[PDB]
């Protein structure tokens, strides 16, 4: 299962964090710059094509309801478009969006 865990609006795009989590492993992928055309159109098919850091591998958490930033974590298939509405105000608090 792939979760959209954190997002940050930039001048020309979006920084995205995606946790691919199987039964016992959580792999965190950081995409520093995702084009705005892919974000605003929920083109989740183009996640991997963008450059990303090597996945940080850790033990899987029990559930992925809330991260440290309090943002509501959504599944990648639900699209970043809905994430933009989930916590637009919480992202406005910490200067991302």
């Amino acid at each position: 299962v792939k979760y959209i865990s954190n997002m940050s609006k930039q001048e020309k795009g979006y920084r995205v964090y995606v946790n691919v989590v199987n039964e016992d492993t959580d792999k965190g992928f950081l995409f520093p710059s995702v084009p705005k055309e892919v974000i605003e159109n929920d083109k989740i098919d183009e996640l991997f094509n963008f450059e990303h850091h090597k996945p940080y591998v850790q033990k899987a958490k029990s559930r992925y309801d809330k991260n440290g930033i309090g943002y509501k974590i959504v599944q990648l298939d639900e699209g970043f478009q809905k994430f933009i509405e989930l916590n637009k105000e919480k992202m406005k608090e910490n200067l991302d969006y």
């Binding site: 940050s8 920084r15 850091h53 991260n67 974590i73």
Partner: protein, 1048 residues
Amino acid sequence: KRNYILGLDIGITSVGYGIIDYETRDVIDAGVRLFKEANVENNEGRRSKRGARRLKRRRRHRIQRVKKLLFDYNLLTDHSELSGINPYEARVKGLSQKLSEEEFSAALLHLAKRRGVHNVNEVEEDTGNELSTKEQISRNSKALEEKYVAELQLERLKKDGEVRGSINRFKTSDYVKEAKQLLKVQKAYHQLDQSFIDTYIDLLETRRTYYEGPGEGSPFGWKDIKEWYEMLMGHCTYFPEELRSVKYAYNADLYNALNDLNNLVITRDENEKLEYYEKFQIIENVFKQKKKPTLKQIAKEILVNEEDIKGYRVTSTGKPEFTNLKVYHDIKDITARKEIIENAELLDQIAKILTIYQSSEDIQEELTNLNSELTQEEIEQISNLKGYTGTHNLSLKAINLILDELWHTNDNQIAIFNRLKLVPKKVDLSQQKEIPTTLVDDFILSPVVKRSFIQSIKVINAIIKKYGLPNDIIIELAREKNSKDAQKMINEMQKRNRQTNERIEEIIRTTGKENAKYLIEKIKLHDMQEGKCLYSLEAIPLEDLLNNPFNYEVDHIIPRSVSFDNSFNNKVLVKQEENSKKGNRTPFQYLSSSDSKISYETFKKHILNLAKGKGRISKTKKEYLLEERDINRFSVQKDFINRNLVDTRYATRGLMNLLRSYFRVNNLDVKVKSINGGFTSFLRRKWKFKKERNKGYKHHAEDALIIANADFIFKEWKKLDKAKKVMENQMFEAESMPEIETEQEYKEIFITPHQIKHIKDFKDYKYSHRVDKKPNRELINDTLYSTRKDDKGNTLIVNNLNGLYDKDNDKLKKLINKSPEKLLMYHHDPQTYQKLKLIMEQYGDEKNPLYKYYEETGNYLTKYSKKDNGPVIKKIKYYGNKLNAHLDITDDYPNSRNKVVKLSLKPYRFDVYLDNGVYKFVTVKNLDVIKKENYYEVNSKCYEEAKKLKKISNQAEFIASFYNNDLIKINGELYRVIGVNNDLLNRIEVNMIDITYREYLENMNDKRPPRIIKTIASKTQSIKKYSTDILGNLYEVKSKKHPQIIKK
């Protein structure tokens, strides 16, 4: 022949070497080579004194030539006399009346002695008398609008009474005019040829130009302009045929600017480096349009923000350091004609003209002789340019080649030099048996590091010769530039540690405990961050910190896996959960992920506001926290290891390049590497090899051994191989297969004291001392003294007292209050002494009473006079000490009533003889050596007299001779020779080898005089000579009886 990991520690006075077995980690050997610290002040003084001798000899020879000329035309004879001739009066009289031969030639000689200045432009700052030389000459010439120099000199002599001084500064043009008018009217009575007048005028207004140099026979001279030019610039280190370029050339400026530009890192959606078109657009639109570039202009050039840009050279304050365009903008502010300013060859020629030529008219004539589109008024404006000096490292050919390679690629000078691997072609490294030491000479390094490199290179040579070719060599260079820079750093370290200690004492007095002393690191980190974690921005209370720190961890921002940076600029006191969620991640790679706290934009705002706040964040730490790069690439690991693990300083860079080139030319596969100092510091700290270093010279070897072990660790783990392949610049095949991941892996591989006890418990070190045998050192003390023979038979030296009208010179009051009989006016002028004592008793409150007297009355002290018309006192002669040892120079002074001597005959060596079973010795002073054309010969007469002084018999079996630091062994005890202390009492001064005697006494807190003096007489069992290798192996010495007299 066992392969070893050679370790070198290079300092300013020591070269420590450690030989450690390659596959068993045991210590094969360890030693220290010692040498006095080289200093540019000695050469500077020698050069200044050589120039002074040149000036004096030239003036004297000019006077002798005028004398020969006057003897030719019978203006004098070998029977004339000018005892009563005052040259000033006769010189002013020659302008209007007849001069006798005796009156004429005296004025001519007095003119030839002091002839003024040709070019007013060249002048020094040696003016304590507040007067510019140019300004003084201009004021005098303005006073000379309707007067000759003779008239002005004589009228000043008649008005005040002074002629000589800083006011007698004229230019040669005016003296020449006066001499010409004198010859004009004086030609009628004495038969003088026109060619004679021209010869005298020539002898008056002729001086050597700065490009002709010394005449024939001088080893420092030359033949024509080409030879002087080649000598000044010097052959390129790489290209023997092409000479070096000027430091402020156009091509060199552009090369440095593009190096700076290629060192850039920009956080943009495009390539993070700089492309070709962007670089050319920057050069034209920013560099060619502004003199001193700023980060703001280069940022706004390519539509980026200045804050997103990283990796720029910085100044001492925190401003970007970008290469400014010197010649381009110095020319553009005079003419904007594209043909003149753009042509690179024209600007290169202008740079070469302005640098090696300095007088205005020569610059004009040689730019005029550079036939081009150049106008004439532009030459007039360009002549007055300033600040074009220096010689570049490489020639213009290599400059252009590296310029092409820099324009087209993204590499810098370091990367290009590592890539192409061009070899020094001055001395061919192929058919040379040993390491060439002359290659260090061509490098533009200070003589201190130059001497240190020569010593280290010869030590490596001896190690290779006596043990075979090594496998791995590692070299660490000291941080200190000279002793004074070391003292600056030591003073700042003690001051900062004292301030932190006082702050910790204040904190401990606030809360109350000895608990604050153990928390230093954390407490300082917290202090630099106003009690705030950086990952989570949660408040970090200081009371909670003092109570239970275990939840506040000192996390390393960039992982120890790649960064290798353990410095203070790489620690953040944070919550335990943040560190547990960080792991082997960077704050950029962590803060945006799920496991983290508040997002990255808030942290960026906080950290950029803290970096601007009171300088609490270093630039290095600020760049660490905002590393938005993927540390999993090879480029970032390469950058990190090159910066914080390899010595990027130019000196170590050149030493490395030389060693690697010599090893690769002979196809000898040997790997050499250099290591950063802070890393070895962290190693020595966490190993606890020796926390405090006071044992002595042995320390210099120890660290060497340590870094050898360091190299050892970089061979024992397949993961670390990448670092081993970066610290040596050995080509690695995208590999990235083995690695070190958890910072605990760093702690296990590095901190673990593997084979540390064997490095501690070693007690068989070696020491080698340097012997200075060069004669013709400082012979005598420069100042010259007079003597007076008092009623007591002992002779007395007269010291002078200057500057009687300063404010912090209480020496006169000291002399009058302690014992006034030391002054000479006590015995030979008691009335003036009584007046001076009255003034002294008058102004006790002020420090120097005579200054306050002069400031309140406007008249400095006058000698006792019945009509009150006595002269001025400016200096006072007073008695000094006796005359025990002295060099008498009475023969040089005619019919002197007092013996004139100089002090402190400097000793050169001492030869130990054995006469009838008792040891004696003769001290050979530096005066006893005559310098016959690079053949130094000991004066047989003076040496025989010195032998006779000690009543040394002829049958005395000569034992040996000892120069500086030649090891001696007396009574069975071995020492090093500092030198003759008092030859008359048969005493010498020695010292220990493994430690200084001062430190030997400071270890046991002894208060004995920290210097060892031994007496060589019948109270001495034996005297033997011992030397050492350039590695530290002791050896006896065949006397080769009949001590050395000739020195090549």
